[PDB]
Amino acid sequence: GPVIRVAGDSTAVGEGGRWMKEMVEAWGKKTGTRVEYIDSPADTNDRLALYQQYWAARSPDVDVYMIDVIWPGIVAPHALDLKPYLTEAELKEFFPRIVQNNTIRGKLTSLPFFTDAGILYYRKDLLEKYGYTSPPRTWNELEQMAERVMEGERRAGNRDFWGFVFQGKPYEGLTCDALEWIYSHGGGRIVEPDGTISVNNGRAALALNRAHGWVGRIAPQGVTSYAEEEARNVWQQGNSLFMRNWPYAYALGQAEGSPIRGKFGVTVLPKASADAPNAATLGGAQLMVSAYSRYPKEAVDLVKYLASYEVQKDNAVRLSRLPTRPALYTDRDVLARNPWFRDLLPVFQNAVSRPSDVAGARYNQVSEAIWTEVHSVLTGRKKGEQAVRDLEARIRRILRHHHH
Numbered sequence: 001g002p003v004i005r006v007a008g009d010s011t012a013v014g015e016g017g018r019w020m021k022e023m024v025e026a027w028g029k030k031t032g033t034r035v036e037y038i039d040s041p042a043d044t045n046d047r048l049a050l051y052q053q054y055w056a057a058r059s060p061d062v063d064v065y066m067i068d069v070i071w072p073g074i075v076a077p078h079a080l081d082l083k084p085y086l087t088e089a090e091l092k093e094f095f096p097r098i099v100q101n102n103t104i105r106g107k108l109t110s111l112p113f114f115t116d117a118g119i120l121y122y123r124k125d126l127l128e129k130y131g132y133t134s135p136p137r138t139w140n141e142l143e144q145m146a147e148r149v150m151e152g153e154r155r156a157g158n159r160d161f162w163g164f165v166f167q168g169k170p171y172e173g174l175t176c177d178a179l180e181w182i183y184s185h186g187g188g189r190i191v192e193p194d195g196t197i198s199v200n201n202g203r204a205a206l207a208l209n210r211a212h213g214w215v216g217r218i219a220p221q222g223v224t225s226y227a228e229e230e231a232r233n234v235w236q237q238g239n240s241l242f243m244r245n246w247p248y249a250y251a252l253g254q255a256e257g258s259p260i261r262g263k264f265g266v267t268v269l270p271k272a273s274a275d276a277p278n279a280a281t282l283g284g285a286q287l288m289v290s291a292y293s294r295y296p297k298e299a300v301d302l303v304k305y306l307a308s309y310e311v312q313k314d315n316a317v318r319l320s321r322l323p324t325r326p327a328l329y330t331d332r333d334v335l336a337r338n339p340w341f342r343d344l345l346p347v348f349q350n351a352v353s354r355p356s357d358v359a360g361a362r363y364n365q366v367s368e369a370i371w372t373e374v375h376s377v378l379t380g381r382k383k384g385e386q387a388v389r390d391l392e393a394r395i396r397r398i399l400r401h402h403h404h
């Protein structure tokens with residue numbers, strides 16, 4: 001019988017790869033279908049380049065791909081339209097915003113699998129130890145808390161201790177972190193939904209200069225090479241007061257044998273001032289059937305199973321990853337395990353998107369521009385003012401003659 005082959009998630013990032021293979025194998029056992037899991041590199045932009053090799057070749061060697069929320073406009077030609085396979089009632093069980101994101105020129109490229117939003121992780125034990133009752137609401141507060149707690153923990157002999165870790169490596173995760181810095185300073189969305197390239201403004205410049213000012217001071221010098229896992233590893237070992245990361249790090253930090261089990265909470269990221277917007281970059285994964293799959297029916301069945309209530313529930317309970325089904329946010333077992341899913345649901349719903357809708361199939365080029373110009377500020381090569389001017393110019397060239 002057919003062998004259904006899946007590429008999605010990575011064994012290099014938390015438990016995602018391992019869990020994904022387990023789910024695919026469970027489907028295979030349930031249906032009596034042979035399955036194979038193909039592993040992927042950690043970083044989304046590397047995954048995209050890998051999958052593009054299969055797509056360019058029209059390869060039948062992968063039937064199902066896990067695709068990033070930023071990808072439908074790029075990958076649509078390589079996706080089987082799922083719309084004829086789903087009833088309107090079935091589709092309404094997912095958040096409509098994500099179904100819409102995944103629909104490109106009428107083609108439902110992919111089913112919503114898990115969502116994602118950037119959040120602030122904080123050491124509650126250390127806040128209490130140093131006289132703070134709440135996590136920081138403004139970036140200035142975050143800096144002040146980080147300096148005071150670092151001073152004390154260093155003095156007490158933890159030479160590995162930092163105030164803040166985040167994703168500063170030149171890759172897609174930095175575009176996510178930088179959108180949050182820029183938007184939370186009232187500096188806009190980099191490229192607005194209407195197409196306006198707005199990033200050349202003083203608030204965006206200030207956001208980038210602020211981030212530079214962390215490097216080597218409250219954040220390690222090496223933070224300019226950190227992706228999700230590098231940040232998480234410093235944090236999880238007990239060596240950072242604060243971390244910006246995604247939901248998945250919560251379950252990992254709570255696992256038996258984690259140095260920080262029971263010592264942390266999560267909240268919305270800080271912002272420049274009370275009247276700035278909260279920023280949480282929208283992330284997450286969707287499930288695509290390859291246009292080149294020889295087994296569309298079987299692959300659709302697998303995608304439906306993976307996106308089902310009980311599989312998403314398992315993802316939420318065991319891996320603290322966010323459902324794309326609103327009904328799961330009222331599920332007693334989901335909430336007992338992750339009470340913060342309720343507290344932060346409005347943050348998740350109000351997550352700010354990267355400019356993938358407006359950039360469409362040129363999104364990856366736009367994002368590479370963003371992360372390289374932002375990186376040049378983090379490394380000290382450029383100031384924020386020059387970097388946003390140069391970024392404006394780069395994005396104008398990329399998007400010239402593109403309309404949405």
Ligand SMILES: OC[C@H]1O[C@H](O)[C@H](O)[C@@H](O)[C@@H]1O
Nearest residue numbers: 044068069116172173283284
């Ligand atoms: O590193 C950046 C990536 O981080 C997470 O995987 C998000 O789910 C994804 O949307 C984002 O592109």
